[model samples]
Target: GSSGSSGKRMRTSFKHHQLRTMKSYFAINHNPDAKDLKQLAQKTGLTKRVLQVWFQNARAKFRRNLLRQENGGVSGPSSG
Candidate 1:
């Protein structure tokens, strides 16, 4: 039931330097207020929606990675 229909295939798109900017932004240890997010979007040349989604995903991934570190004292147990 989850398969694609209408003879259309899904495509993945990524912006340049999105991950790098996101990493730097989150690594600064701030709550990312709206103004800051907007400025970041401008600096990274990403749309507001894209930046918002990126932040959401980045936050989740950051929490998961932080939890892994706290629980196991290592990075990416599945890196193998």
Candidate 2:
């Protein structure tokens, strides 16, 4: 068996519009259900698989950044 350009792939750069839309949708729901993926597919003109893939990848970044600013400001008990 011979191989020719069969092991290479693109990073699949995302458009700003797509990014914005995905981000907005992700802000509302970290994980989109089948129904949500369908809706997003229509809105973005992208396949369900593409959106699912994009969302899965985007969600990690979203959650990571979202957790960065988490503060533990619990009021301490009265001084002993």
Candidate 3:
């Protein structure tokens, strides 16, 4: 039995505007390119890596609650 101790609880405590920026940017772009993400960092004063995780979780948001339920039709942005 390897039950891991769940003690670690830490991440950036986002500013109110920071969250607003993320929500707004997440609306425009579910996934941003390298340059695009950099712009988000400039606007929010957070790192690009942090924004990556933010967007990753936000994508799950639509899956969890939205399911594109409101929009006439929408698709998340992505490119390989």
Candidate 4:
């Protein structure tokens, strides 16, 4: 039911250096405060909202990968 009926698509591209910088920052701090976000915005020329969304998505992906590895790609409730 959650198909692409809205037909809305948004794509963003960041330079290699930008992505590298962001990934480094993410490695150090997955959760950045507002001040940190503002500083990162100035450095990356991206809006706070964009950075927030990027971090959120990154964290989600990271979590998914971690769980997948822990469970050998099998997702289900614990037997306990």
Candidate 5:
């Protein structure tokens, strides 16, 4: 599935609204006990795969911010 660009390129025609809705769902339920990816997917109307990817990205992003804060790094743009 490589695009010959040294890596695989994901399809670029994904639905953004689904992503937005999924994110909103995550935000609303980001407490300590949000176990089970399927539950989240159901609530957000997103596929489990999508929910899993979003959760992975969210954790990475949170780690980046935490590291920056600990090192006194300047904040990035306020635009999410």
Candidate 6:
């Protein structure tokens, strides 16, 4: 197996408004329909793939925080 998978990870800093919009949308629904993603892309000028990945990562982060809180700062074993 390769030392690292695929291309290097991208490093992009999102604008405050863009983050706010995404967070608001996530608050409403973690899994947005294609139409919603397109609408957000038009508003934020981010591509559909970027928006999709952002939402995915945001959901994962939220889950991790919630788990940590529930476990009193003790997280479960890592998954493969």
On TM-score, the leading prediction is: 6
- What total of clashing residue pairs does each candidate reach? 0, 0, 0, 0, 0, 0
Error of 6 at 76 (Å): 20
* Cα lDDT listed for each candidate: 0.67, 0.75, 0.76, 0.79, 0.59, 0.82
Prediction RMSDs, each to the true structure: 9.0, 8.1, 8.4, 7.1, 9.6, 7.4
Per-model TM values vs. the true structure: 0.56, 0.61, 0.63, 0.66, 0.44, 0.70
Best of the two (2, 6) by TM-score: 6
lDDT of 1 by residue, 6-51 (tens): 4432334675576577668777844677887888777887777666
Off by over 4 Å in 3: 1-12, 67-80
Task: Tell me the tens digit of each residue's lDDT in model 6 across 1-80.
Answer: 67344553455689998788888999899899999999999888899989988887787778888756454644556772
* Clash list (residue pairs), candidate 4: none
Give the RMSD in angstroms, all C-alphas superposed, for model 3: 8.4
Q: Which lDDT tens digits does candidate 4 get at residues 1-80? A: 66234443355778876677778999899889999999998888789978887887788778887766465545566883
Residue 54 lDDT in candidate 4: 85
As a TM-score, model 6 comes out at 0.70
**Better model by lDDT: candidate 1 vs candidate 5:** 1
lDDT of 1 at 78: 93
User: Can you tell me which runs of candidate 5 are displaced by over 4 Å?
Assistant: 1-35, 70-80
Q: What ordering of candidates by TM-score runs from best to worst?
A: 6, 4, 3, 2, 1, 5
Measured on C-alpha atoms, candidate 3 has an lDDT of 0.76
